Design a protein around this ligand. Structure first.
Ligand SMILES: CC(=O)N[C@H]1[C@H]([C@H](O)[C@H](O)CO)O[C@@](O[C@H]2[C@@H](O)[C@@H](CO)O[C@@H](O[C@H]3[C@H](O)[C@@H](O)[C@H](O)O[C@@H]3CO)[C@@H]2O)(C(=O)O)C[C@@H]1O
Ligand SMILES: CC(=O)N[C@H]1[C@H]([C@H](O)[C@H](O)CO)O[C@@](O[C@H]2[C@@H](O)[C@@H](CO)O[C@@H](O[C@H]3[C@H](O)[C@@H](O)[C@H](O)O[C@@H]3CO)[C@@H]2O)(C(=O)O)C[C@@H]1O
Ligand code: NAG
Ligand code: NAG
Ligand code: NAG
Ligand code: NAG
Ligand code: NAG
Ligand code: CA
Ligand code: CA
Ligand code: MN
Ligand code: MN
Lengths: 239, 239
């Protein structure tokens, strides 16, 4: 594909154009629930991933060009016990066939097996990290944050994010190919607060020609559970 | 129009789909020069405005709906004397036939006659203010800033903007109709710095059904002159 664009205003149960991994799924009410919820209550140690069914062409060696893209989606992270929550969700690009790694992966938002930034992971992600205690996440700044990750959970760049328990967030992620710059942005219309981050990233150097795009999220200790619900999602890429 | 979308990757001299006001124009090199430049040096007390030729439908009383839009553009503000510059540029929406007001309008970025927030102005703008001394701009915060204006030069909301003399900026402005939220964002791929702001705005309440969209900029005292050049511009609105 040289141009791919899709808009999902309302998710549908077992949505055909979505590849589900782990405990992810969309509720009868139309929300993409990354982590498991029962009776409206988020469940402990849940890991989920949803990907758009069609692989996306990120670059062409025959062409020499690289894709520029932009994604926007709305989500809610509602926790019964706000004080300390875990772990957060993230939008990411990975190889078409990636699976959730085996092992302790909650503090890695379901994207990694460990802290390392292994070049083989081939993963570019934008995380919305809700857990930052150094006892379990020693690589995190001391506050909830939005970070840009490249082959590793230790964000190459972050910004402080003032999460609103149950607040509806509108986030857009944009990649300017010509400028190898990935920028992330989040807004809470309810508080009129904004957050943003940018980092240099050369997709040609990190990701393969084809990749699948989507979301990943994880839940940890029971007293810190929160939801990772996505309500809308639009994606556009142009090669 | 129920949907309008245009992308201008390169401006052309006397570009037919652009309405020029004041000293605005596009150079032979293809840059939209809001304020006049001669021999590559910005001139004092210059005021310019450029608008897309076609008026945009912002809302429909017969339909009940309101337009959601998003604009992205790249610009450069190069000043020979960085220390203190004036005045800045801005993207704005106004009535189809608005003209540059008469009088001292440089500290108002070519958008207003005075400080007042007169409901009759019908102007929603996002300013990139480079001059903030309280002696002439008593309404400004104490730093260069990006602010959201509504019928007046005194921004209803701002954020600190760390201008880069001659740096190429990529800015996007988005209006979420359903949430009456106008958000502004700027990034300098060269420093990987980001800035963003959001504010509650009800276009139905401020602007008329039809409006023209574009840019405004002004230059002041000779020792503080700077350029207000726009390189790219894409606009999309959907009713
Ligand atoms: C094999 C296995 O099941 N590993 C778990 C780990 C283990 O708890 C860990 O290996 C024990 O050393 O926990 C995992 O989730 C943890 C993760 O969410 C972190 C931070 O993101 O928080 C941990 O919860 C803490 C909690 O924050 C404290 O307040 C509490 O006192 O202790 C809790 C730990 O018991 C989560 O357990 C992990 O990803 O490492 C999930 C693995 O499956
Ligand atoms: C009638 C008229 O021509 N008005 C000018 C005004 C006049 O200078 C003002 O009415 C005198 O009180 O200036 C206008 O531009 C000014 C504006 O750009 C402000 C701030 O944005 O800066 C002024 O320059 C200052 C400069 O910053 C100082 O360092 C310097 O010492 O004094 C300068 C003023 O002389 C600009 O003049 C204006 O918008 O008010 C342009 C009007 O056309
Ligand atoms: C392009 O890349 C594909 C796989 O990455 C390879 O099989 C093909 O031979 C390459 N062709 C060129 C011209 O690089
Ligand atoms: C990552 O997955 C591999 C499977 O090849 C497994 O051997 C390894 O234990 C996992 N990493 C961790 C930290 O468990
Ligand atoms: C925007 O408004 C709609 C309808 O009023 C609401 O359902 C939605 O959650 C809001 N979105 C955001 C990001 O606040
Ligand atoms: C500019 O302000 C003056 C008063 O200072 C006013 O008389 C004039 O009408 C305004 N300009 C325009 C175009 O209305
Ligand atoms: C992005 O890269 C292009 C090509 O190198 C350049 O012309 C443009 O000014 C850059 N934009 C930004 C915001 O740096
Ligand atoms: Ca964390
Ligand atoms: Ca000012
Ligand atoms: Mn983190
Ligand atoms: Mn200002």
């Amino acid at each position: 594909s040289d141009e791919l664009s899709f808009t999902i205003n309302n998710f549908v149960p077992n949505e055909a154009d979505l590849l589900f991994q782990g405990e992810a799924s969309v509720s009868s009410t139309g929300v993409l629930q990354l982590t498991k919820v029962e009776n409206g209550q988020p469940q402990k140690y849940s890991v989920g991933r949803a990907l758009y069914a069609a692989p996306v062409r990120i670059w062409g060696n025959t062409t020499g060009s690289v894709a520029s893209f932009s994604t926007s989606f709305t989500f809610v992270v509602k926790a019964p016990n706000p004080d300390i929550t875990s772990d957060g969700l993230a939008f990411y690009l990975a190889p078409p066939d990636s699976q959730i790694p085996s092992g302790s992966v909650s503090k890695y938002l379901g994207l990694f097996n460990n802290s390392n930034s292994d070049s083989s992971n081939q993963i570019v992600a934008v995380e919305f990290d809700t857990y930052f205690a150094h006892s379990y996440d020693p690589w995190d700044p001391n506050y909830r944050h939005i970070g840009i990750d490249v082959n590793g959970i230790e964000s190459i760049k972050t910004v402080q994010w003032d999460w609103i328990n149950g607040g509806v967030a509108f986030a857009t992620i944009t990649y300017l190919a010509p400028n190898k710059t990935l920028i992330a942005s989040l807004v809470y219309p309810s508080n009129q607060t904004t957050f943003s981050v940018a980092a240099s990233v050369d997709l040609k150097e990190i990701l393969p020609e084809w990749v699948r795009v989507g979301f990943s999220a994880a839940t940890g200790y029971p007293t810190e559970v929160e939801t990772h619900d996505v309500l809308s999602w639009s994606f556009t890429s142009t090669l």
